[model samples]
Each structure stands twice: as C-alpha cells, then as structure tokens.
Target: RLRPWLEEQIQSGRYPGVQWLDQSARVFQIPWKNIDKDATLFRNWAIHTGRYKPGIDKPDPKTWKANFRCALNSLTDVKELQDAFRVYALL
Candidate 1:
C-alpha cells in the first residue's frame, strides 16, 4: 500500500499518478514522467549501463548528456520528460 502522507499529493497534482507493481516484477515496469534530475538521477544510471558499458568504467556525464540531448530532440512533450525523470530518480 502507498504511504498515507503521499496520498494527498497523489490525489492532487504534486504527483500525477503512480504505477502499482507486483513484488515479483522488476521495478522498471513503472512509468516515471518528470524532469527533476536531482530527485530521479538513478534512472539515468540504469539506461547508461544498459546502452553502453565498458570493461573499465561507467559512462561519464558528458556522454550521458550527449545521448540525452539526442533523446530530447526526438521527444516533443513533457510526458516523455517526466518518464525520463523516473529513470534519473533511481540513477
């Protein structure tokens, strides 16, 4: 169950919606749609790992920014931005 404190925000606009998930499933199923990178940076890390990983180390911010810019160019709506935030939030 969701925390009671967050219910108000969920009901209002602070949090638009939440995707409920099953315990057995990976958390990736949820759709996060926001642009506040500070709050959702983890998602960025996950995608970076999936798309490009090397024997030495993880992707640097410069590489991530370049790829992110390309993605933003393709998307033309805030919804996509929000989704991006979800990934970054976890990153």
Candidate 2:
C-alpha cells in the first residue's frame, strides 16, 4: 500500500540524499539508487507500527488517506526513519 507512494515520492526527486546514524553513533549516507530497497523496508515498518494501514477497518478512504499523510509528515527525515526501520526489521 504505502510502498507505491514511497516509491513515487522518492522518484520525484524530493530527497536527493539521505543521512542517518548507525548503532554506534556513526552517520551513513544512502544515495537515491539504494532508496527503493530501504523505502520498502520502511513501509513494512510503518505498517507493522500501525502508522499506516489500509483495509475495511477504516471504512472511509479519505480519512485513511489523511491519516497516512499525517504519519508521513510526522517523520523528520525519510532516511532516518528508514534506518530505524532497518534496525527493527533486523530484530
């Protein structure tokens, strides 16, 4: 669900480069080419964490869309969030 939107946003050239910190307080950079893989991972985490869910439970499409937008806007950086997603995905 969110994967498509994630791909769209990344491909739109909104995020040129992403910055995130490693476990040991080291920062790493990921270029646009590698963002798709990381974005997919992050979308899974978003679903797992209840940030974005698409189903009949919500009933209203508009409401769910708004919720999804809100969730995405809440994050400071897509790359940073993806890094956290990677940590959780590994766990």
Candidate 3:
C-alpha cells in the first residue's frame, strides 16, 4: 500500500529530482552539526510547555494497538505534523 503511493509520486515530477540516500550518515551531510547553528532549532523544538513531559498522552493500559516490536503491523498517519516532516524520495 505504501509502495504504490510512493511509486506514483515518483512518477509525478512536480518537485526536486530524487536521489536515493546511500549510507544514512552520508545523506545527512548538511552543515548543522554539534554546537552549530542547528542548536537553536534543537532547543527550540524541545521547549514545549505541556504537562506531559514533552507531550505524548497516556495510553489506555489494556489491549489497544498492541505491539510486539520484533514484527509489526503499522502504517503512519501524519496529520498536523506535516510541517515537521521533510520527505525525500528515492527512485
């Protein structure tokens, strides 16, 4: 299901050209390193004033979205988090 949607987007050339990321380390080679200018962004995103330390709500303790981490069934639904995500595609 995820593959189909992505493949379709790959064909639609409405954005920047795609380049498959090689070693994750190499792909993240932007200049924002430790104590770099990105520090302000790091501290800024963490400064949330919500009561639940960093703001993830408590889960209902019993039988809901059960997880067995070794194998999984999950698909993500990103709603308001669109701005926080910068998706890059690889063909």
Candidate 4:
C-alpha cells in the first residue's frame, strides 16, 4: 500500500503537502527539494524497526510530517540521512 506513495514521492519529489514546522513551532518552507528525502526517511526507519504494518495500519502523513519536522530541521552537519535514501533508491 505504502510502496505506491514511496514511488510517487521519488518520481514527483513532492511531500506530504503539509508545511514544515521549526523551532518554537514556527512555520516555514521545507528544505529545498526535501520531499523526496522526507518520503524515504521514515519508511526505512519504520519498516526496518517493525513499526509499520502492511495493510493493517494506515499512514498518517500529517502526524508523520509534524513529528519528523524535528529531525528534518536538525539536519545540518549529517547528510547521511538523505544520502542513504538517495543511494538506496538507486536499486
């Protein structure tokens, strides 16, 4: 179910369509061309960690984006997160 969304995100580079939140809950644009990275980020984490269940659970894009804003905002020195997604997608 979620794999379709994953592919669409990779193809379109669009995100959850929700705005990003910053420190102090300030609203701002998501980091440039970040939707693709954002889309890949959680799936790897959630799936690898067994937090996501296929067909049994629904994706909460709103909440996922909201909560993941912290990590997204904090991404500065370590681009490993995005790199992982980019390279992995090469398969």
Candidate 5:
C-alpha cells in the first residue's frame, strides 16, 4: 500500500525530489534524526489531552482520522506549514 502510493506520487511528477525512507537516516542527503517528530508529538499530545492511551501500538480509525485533522489544523495556521501542506497534498 505504501509503496504503491509512493510510486504513484513519483510518477505523478508532483514530488520529483521526494524520496521515501523506511527509517530515519538521510533525506535528500541530509541527516534526519527526528523523522517521526510529528507523529511522536501528536501521540504525546493526544495522550496528554485524554484522546489516546499509552502502550497502544495503533490508534482507532476515528482517532487516527481525528488526529490527522487536528495535526493539520495545528500547522495550517502557520504560513510555512500551510505551504508544506500544499506540497503534501500534491503527493
């Protein structure tokens, strides 16, 4: 599923320079030690806000959707993040 979506993104010419990495290492030849930053932060925030619980490997479908929406909302207020979101939508 992930590979097919990435392949589609690649073939679409919308993200020519984008490269998918299974684990954090080098992205575009630059070190990316915190590639999971957003997910980690969101999980922590959700737990703190009583929206999630610790030790859960996967979130519920509704929770996951809500998290994605809230995460986008948390960033879309900023110009830079909004621009990034536009690029992500292209992918």
Candidate 6:
C-alpha cells in the first residue's frame, strides 16, 4: 500500500520524491530536515506554557495532530501534504 502511494508520488511531481533521497539515509535525513525544527519549537512552546512533556499527552493523536500542524505549516514550500514527504520523510 505504502509502496504504490510512494511510487505515485515519485512518478508524479508530488512530495515523496523518493528518487532524490537515499533509502538508507532517508529515515534520518527526512525527519531531521522537516520535522525536527517544528518538533523542537513545539516542545519549547509547550515548556514555556508549563504544559508540555514527552511520552505523555503529547503522543495522544489529538494532541499530536495539534502539534503536528506547527510542523506542517512551517513547510511553506510544500504545496500539499504529499509534498511534505519529499523533505520530511513522513512522521
């Protein structure tokens, strides 16, 4: 399922752009490039509010979705959700 979806992106001009990424290094590179900054920011923001902690409410889907938006929006260059994988490698 994931392969076909990824292939479609690779074939199209969409996000995954798997061809440009090294399969082995992608695991780290993708997230590091995209999500790390946002995740760190979210963590800092939460800490400032005295409401942030890891492996707790943060991981709850609802909370994560809220936090994830910060990461997603930071990718202004990403035309759509699909394009995010091209840089972030998906989370």
In terms of lDDT, which candidate is strongest?
2
- Local distance difference test, each candidate: 0.34, 0.40, 0.26, 0.39, 0.38, 0.39
Stretches of candidate 1 exceeding 4 Å from the true structure:
1-49, 54-56, 79-91
Clashes of each: 15, 0, 0, 0, 0, 1
Q: Higher lDDT: candidate 1 or 6?
A: 6
lDDT at position 76, candidate 2: 46
lDDT of 5 by residue, 1-91 (tens): 2223333443443433444332232211111121242343334446655777755655543454456445544553222112121223222
Candidate 4 Cα misplacement greater than 4 A, ranges: 1-51, 78-91
Pick out the ten consecutive residues of candidate 5 with the lowest summed lDDT: 26-35
Per-model TM-score on C-alpha atoms: 0.29, 0.26, 0.21, 0.31, 0.29, 0.25
Choose 5 or 6, whichever is better by TM-score: 5
Report the Cα lDDT for candidate 6: 0.39
Model 1, span 38-84: residue lDDT tens: 31223343354475444455445455555544553444331221323
Model 6 ranges off by over 4 Å: 1-59, 81-91
Model 2 lowest lDDT segment of ten: 82-91
Residue-level lDDT for 8 in candidate 4: 44
lDDT of 2 by residue, 32-81 (tens): 12113233334433555566574523333343445555655454444333
Model 2 scores a TM of 0.26
- The window of 10 residues in a row where model 6 has the poorest summed lDDT is 26-35
Per-residue lDDT for 1-91 in model 3, tens only?
Answer: 4334433433443323322234342221111221222222222222321212323654221212122111112333311112222333222
Q: Whole-model lDDT for model 2 versus the true structure?
A: 0.40
